[PDB]
Ligand binder design. Structure first.
Ligand SMILES: CC(C)c1[nH]nc2c(NCc3ccc(-c4ccccn4)cc3)nc(SCCN)nc12
Ligand SMILES: [Br-]
Ligand SMILES: [Cl-]
Lengths: 258, 288
């Protein structure tokens, strides 16, 4: 473990409550649906693969979209402009070499101009009040991985796969904090591969029992079982790659006995 | 922006130009950091400085007061502090700075730094020009344009980081990973610099930088830093200098100050002391 592993964990805990978006915001959006958000997020997974962006960059972009749509109404034909600016900002925050604006414009097939993307950027910054350093599922997972005894690369990839699936479906995952989804994703991955359970040292560090994780786990297990049928498939196709040891082809257990 | 009267340019830093200005309504003297926006939109340095400094509320970190997007420009409004550490050291280049003031300043910078680190932020440009002193005796970290939110554990980050004189050997020798230890190295150099009023390692290239480090601390090998001779930019033709005794290098320092400085300037990043552990060092026994 590195020097501040506990101080950082405690702080990320405090920040995730402040950076959380409104649980029911899509009900109040007159013109967009959860299904349109799923199509947007799944497209950004493709963009991430195409430009070789980090998984952290994708998780941040989604957090910016959810916080932006919690306070602004958006028409369907402008939803992809929101996502594009969000991805641009996430990349400038997190990446060593962000793609350029001109490239982000190109991947929308000239639906929007460069000027629109830079103005949407200003708007997103203003609406989010420049607070970009949000805790993600990814940041929690990588800390949780330091408690594996011993490390198992199949567990780590499967847990990343499940974490990333949760970005697609606002209902239900908007009702959970990132640290909870990461705990559910880690336990489910661990159980699928080795048959072991959410370990004692993580209960100690997180204050979460399996019991506290159970509602999210019930939700995540259903997401996992139904993933081959999902209208959106970019994440699944991505975790077929050998880089992620083909974990998206593994069979989910039939029950969790919880 | 109509509320501000520019008084004068006071410096540059990582990105943009910095001005002293006066709020016309409240009378408050501020510092304005200007970015012109004219191609990639808002620079990543600005996006990062702003998001991070909004979280970093601490008495030894400079306070961000406001962000104003005017017509083609971005202005960051900051508290103004009357002096930087570099100028303060130049004006004391003959008398010296009394060791208890050095101790206090170091203690305060370490508090600011431990805060950043416990809040997952690397500064990556600690040098005396970016350390600001107010009329009260407070010192504060500034210019977070090169800073970055880091993960647990870290990945690979930008290689071209930290002003040369303050840059850690693990960056210079090309390690794949670096972390909180790069900031502590910088502070070690600054600690030494307050004592002697001259930069500890003033190199004029990357190789010359290493050589200045080696001459003083001894040329690292596998005894002191396991893995060093395998590092990307390590060369078997590096000269082998012996390490110098600290009571010649920083004579005013007492026993405890020598021990602390040693621990901040360890070659191996895994041996180098953290900011929080440094605050507990016996050297800070009798700190004001
Ligand atoms: C932007 C914000 C973080 C900030 N707040 N106070 C700042 C400050 N105060 C020192 C100073 C004061 C007046 C002068 C001065 C006064 C008159 C004429 C010329 N210069 C110089 C430095 N300096 C700088 S940048 C120069 C140092 N590397 N940034 C500052
Ligand atoms: Br006025
Ligand atoms: Cl001296």
């Amino acid at each position: 473990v590195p020097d501040y592993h506990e101080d950082i964990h405690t702080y990320l805990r405090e920040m995730e409550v402040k950076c959380k978006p409104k649980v029911g915001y899509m009900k109040k959006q007159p013109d967009i649906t959860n299904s349109m958000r799923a199509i947007l997020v799944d497209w950004l997974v493709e963009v991430g693969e195409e430009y070789k962006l980090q998984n952290e960059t994708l998780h941040l972009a989604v957090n910016y979209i959810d916080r932006f749509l919690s306070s602004m109404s958006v028409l369907r034909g402008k939803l992809q402009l929101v996502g594009t600016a969000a991805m641009l900002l996430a990349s400038k925050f997190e990446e060593i070499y962000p793609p350029e604006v001109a490239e982000f414009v190109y991947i929308t097939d000239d639906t929007y101009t460069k000027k629109q993307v830079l103005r949407m950027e200003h708007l997103v910054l203003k609406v989010l009040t420049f607070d970009l350093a949000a805790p993600t599922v990814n940041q929690f997972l990588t800390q949780y991985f330091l408690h594996q005894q011993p490390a198992n690369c199949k567990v780590e990839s499967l847990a990343m796969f499940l974490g990333e699936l949760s970005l697609i479906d606002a209902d239900p995952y908007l009702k959970y904090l990132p640290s909870v989804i990461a705990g559910a994703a880690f336990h489910l991955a661990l159980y699928t591969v080795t048959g072991q359970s959410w370990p004692e040292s993580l209960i100690r560090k997180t204050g979460y029992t399996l019991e506290s994780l159970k509602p999210c786990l019930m939700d995540l297990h259903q997401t996992y079982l139904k993933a081959p049928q999902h209208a959106q498939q970019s994440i699944r196709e991505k975790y077929k790659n050998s880089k992620y040891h083909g974990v998206s082809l593994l069979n989910p257990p039939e029950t969790l006995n919880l | 922006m109509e509320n501000f009267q520019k008084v004068e340019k006071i410096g540059e830093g990582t990105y943009g130009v910095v001005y002293k200005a006066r709020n016309k309504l409240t009378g408050e003297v501020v510092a304005l950091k200007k970015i012109r926006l004219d191609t990639e939109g808002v620079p990543s340095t600005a996006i990062r400085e702003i998001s991070l400094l909004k979280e970093l509320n601490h008495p030894n970190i400079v306070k961000l007061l406001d962000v104003i997007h005017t017509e083609n420009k971005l202005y960051l409004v900051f508290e103004f502090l009357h002096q930087d550490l570099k100028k303060f050291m130049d004006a004391s280049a003959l008398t010296g700075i009394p060791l208890p003031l050095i101790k206090s300043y170091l203690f305060q910078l370490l508090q600011g730094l431990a805060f950043c680190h416990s809040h997952r932020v690397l500064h990556r440009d600690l040098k005396p020009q970016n350390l600001l002193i107010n009329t009260e005796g407070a010192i504060k970290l500034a210019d977070f344009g090169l800073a970055r939110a880091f993960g647990v554990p870290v990945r690979t980050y930008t290689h071209e980081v930290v002003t040369l004189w303050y840059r850690a050997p693990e960056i210079l020798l090309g390690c794949k990973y670096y972390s909180t230890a790069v900031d502590i190295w910088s502070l070690g150099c600054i600690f030494a610099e307050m004592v002697t009023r001259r930069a500890l390692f003033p190199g004029d290239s990357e190789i010359d930088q290493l050589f200045r480090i080696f001459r003083t601390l001894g040329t690292p090998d596998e005894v002191v830093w396991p893995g060093v001779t395998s590092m990307p930019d390590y060369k078997p033709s590096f000269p082998k200098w012996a390490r110098q005794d600290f009571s010649k290098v920083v004579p005013p320092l007492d026993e405890d100050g020598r021990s602390l400085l040693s621990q901040m300037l360890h070659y191996d990043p895994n041996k180098r002391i953290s900011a929080k552990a440094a605050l507990a060092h016996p050297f800070f026994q009798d700190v004001t």
